[PDB]
């Protein structure tokens, strides 16, 4: 009976979960937009992809704190990103990309929902922003000061003047989780209960969307078999998802099941209709409007290059070549303990543009959901540790 594998301060279980000793890498891409002129004048957009851009990651635990006579848990799980040059396609504070201006279009986006709509169309009519703006990589994942932003700053204090992909993501947590240990049961080992203190979510529209399903995904429950299904809560999807069996593996000297994130997660149906805000009417196969939690920015989520889409999303933009192998998001893990021995979660960030009447900023641009960038977040056992492992 594997019941060692139970979040108790004095197991070896606990400390791997308190401070992963495998490195976990995240890998950014870029798409560099190529005819900014052309696109506004109604013509389909160009782009290149560049990178990688790749960060190792800091993870560990705080705030740990147990309860309920042992059977749950309380902790943030904090991240840090230290930059790797040599792992890297080029110096990010250097290498400059081109695309859309983010902040520019949250702030339409806002005025258009009626949020300072009044200081937004003051401003932007005063000093005149561009769609295409260029920025180095540095600046469009970890912060730039916007004109526009810091002009609604003075106005509006807690509107901030800086604004970056992952601003402020940099050494620190997601929120407050309390997870479920294996005490009670071993299937519901790093179960999470509560996030923010809540049991569900609430800017979804169905309580089953709305529904916080599984682990975070850093770990699972021991002896998997292959005919479940596995739910995750990737807190920056904003939803739960599931993954389910793809084929089998081995890394180093240990079998794994591959479990992947099949197309069904994206997909175009009734299952997923509580997740299309407002009335039901969703966006095609393949991409999740993620505004609600993202501060009411227009922004979309995807696979890499559109992978398990609409055919109409990858024509939109020419550049989007998705194939599998590159752009899946799967996991190895280990039946017997649970454990992920590899892994690949890949997501893309996307900005729905449309042309605006009101704005000649948007000139005559297509209605499309427009790539920025995506990552591959990475983990694989080492040879030490997986020896350590194969014993027991
Ligand atoms: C992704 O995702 C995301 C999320 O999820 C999303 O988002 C979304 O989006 C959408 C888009 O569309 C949106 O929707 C929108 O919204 C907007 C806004 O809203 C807000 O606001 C408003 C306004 O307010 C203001 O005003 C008023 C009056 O007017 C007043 O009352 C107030 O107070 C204010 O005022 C202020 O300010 C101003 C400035 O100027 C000044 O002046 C003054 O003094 C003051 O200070 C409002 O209205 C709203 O409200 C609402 O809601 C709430 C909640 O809480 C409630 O409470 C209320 O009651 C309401 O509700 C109700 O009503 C409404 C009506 O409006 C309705 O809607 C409902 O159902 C109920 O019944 C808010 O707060 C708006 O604006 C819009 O609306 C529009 O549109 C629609 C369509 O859908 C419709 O339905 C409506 O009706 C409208 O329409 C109209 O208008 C327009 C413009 O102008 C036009 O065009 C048309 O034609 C029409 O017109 C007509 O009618 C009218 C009546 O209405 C009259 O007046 C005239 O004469 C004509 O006849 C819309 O709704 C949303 O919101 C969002 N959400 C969020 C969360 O974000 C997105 O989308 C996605 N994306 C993708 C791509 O997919
Ligand atoms: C994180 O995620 C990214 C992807 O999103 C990974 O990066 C990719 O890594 C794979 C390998 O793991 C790379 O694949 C290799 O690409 C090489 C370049 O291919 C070019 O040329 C061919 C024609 O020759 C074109 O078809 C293609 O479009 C490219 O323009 C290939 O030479 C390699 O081919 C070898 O493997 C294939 C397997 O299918 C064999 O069939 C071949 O015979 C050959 O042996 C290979 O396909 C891919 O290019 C990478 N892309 C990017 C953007 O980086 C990361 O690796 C991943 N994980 C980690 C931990 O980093
Ligand atoms: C993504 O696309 C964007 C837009 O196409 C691109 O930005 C551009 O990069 C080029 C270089 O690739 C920049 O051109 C340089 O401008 C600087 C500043 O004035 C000059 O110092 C450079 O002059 C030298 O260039 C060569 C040596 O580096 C020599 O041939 C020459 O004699 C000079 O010594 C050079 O002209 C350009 O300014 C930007 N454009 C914008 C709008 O920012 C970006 O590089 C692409 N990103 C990636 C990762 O490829
Ligand atoms: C969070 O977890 C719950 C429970 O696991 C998920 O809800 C469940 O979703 C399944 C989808 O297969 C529902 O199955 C239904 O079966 C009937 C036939 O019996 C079929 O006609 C339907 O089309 C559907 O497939 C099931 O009812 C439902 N169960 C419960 C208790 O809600 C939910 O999807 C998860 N949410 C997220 C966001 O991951
Ligand atoms: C995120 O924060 C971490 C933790 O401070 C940074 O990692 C450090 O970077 C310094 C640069 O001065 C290096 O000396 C070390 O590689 C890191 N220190 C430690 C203790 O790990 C990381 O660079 C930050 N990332 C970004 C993008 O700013
Ligand atoms: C996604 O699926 C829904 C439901 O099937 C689509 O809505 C249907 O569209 C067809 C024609 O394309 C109509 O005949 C039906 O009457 C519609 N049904 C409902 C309930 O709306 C919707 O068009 C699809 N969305 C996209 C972007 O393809
Ligand atoms: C766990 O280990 C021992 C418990 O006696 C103690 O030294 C340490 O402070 C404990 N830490 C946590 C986070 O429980
Ligand atoms: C998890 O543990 C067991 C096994 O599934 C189950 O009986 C219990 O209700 C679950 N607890 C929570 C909080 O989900
Ligand atoms: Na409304
Ligand atoms: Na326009």
């Avoid at 991240?79 to 290498?95: N, T």
């Avoid at 997870?179 to 209960?193: A, M």
Wanted: proline content about 5%; glycine content about 6%; charged content about 25%.
């Amino acid at each position: 009976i594997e019941k060692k594998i139970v979040l108790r301060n004095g197991t070896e279980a606990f400390d791997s979960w308190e401070k992963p000793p495998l490195p976990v890498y995240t890998q950014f891409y870029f798409f560099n937009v190529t005819n900014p002129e052309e696109i506004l004048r109604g013509e389909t957009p160009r782009v290149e992809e560049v990178g990688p851009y790749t960060y190792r990651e800091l993870r560990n635990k705080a705030n740990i704190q147990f309860g309920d006579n042992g059977t749950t848990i309380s902790a943030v799980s904090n991240k840090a990103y230290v930059f790797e040059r040599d792992q890297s396609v080029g110096d990010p504070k250097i290498d400059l990309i081109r695309t859309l201006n983010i902040p520019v279009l949250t702030v339409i986006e806002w005025s258009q929902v009626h949020f300072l709509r009044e200081i937004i169309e003051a401003m932007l009519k005063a000093y005149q922003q561009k769609l295409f703006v260029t920025h180095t990589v540095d600046e469009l994942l970890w912060g730039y000061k916007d004109e526009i932003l810091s002009l609604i700053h003075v106005f509006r204090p807690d509107i901030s003047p800086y604004f970056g992909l992952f601003y402020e993501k940099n050494g620190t947590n997601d929120g407050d989780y309390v997870f479920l240990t294996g005490e009670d049961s071993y299937l519901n080992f790093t179960k999470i209960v509560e996030w923010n203190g809540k049991t569900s979510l609430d800017w979804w529209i169905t309580d089953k969307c709305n529904m916080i399903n599984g682990t975070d995904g850093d770990s699972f429950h021991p002896l998997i078999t292959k005919d479940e299904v596995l739910y995750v809560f990737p807190s920056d999807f904003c939803r739960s998802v599931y993954i389910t069996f793809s084929d089998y593996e081995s890394v180093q000297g240990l079998p794994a099941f591959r479990y992947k994130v099949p197309a069904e997660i994206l997909a175009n149906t009734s299952d997923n209709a509580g997740f299309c805000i407002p009335e039901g009417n969703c966006l095609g196969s393949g991409v999740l409007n993620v505004s609600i939690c993202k501060n009411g920015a227009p922004i979309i989520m995807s696979f890499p290059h559109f992978y398990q889409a609409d055919e109409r999303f990858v024509s939109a933009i020419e550049g989007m070549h998705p194939n599998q192998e590159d752009h899946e998001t799967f996991v190895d893990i280990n039946p017997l303990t649970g454990i992920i021995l590899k892994a690949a979660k890949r997501f893309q960030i996307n900005i729905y543009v449309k042309k605006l009447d009101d704005f000649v900023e948007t000139g005559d641009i297509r209605t499309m959901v427009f790539p920025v960038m995506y990552l591959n977040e990475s983990v694989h056992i080492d040879k030490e540790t997986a020896s350590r492992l194969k014993s027991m």
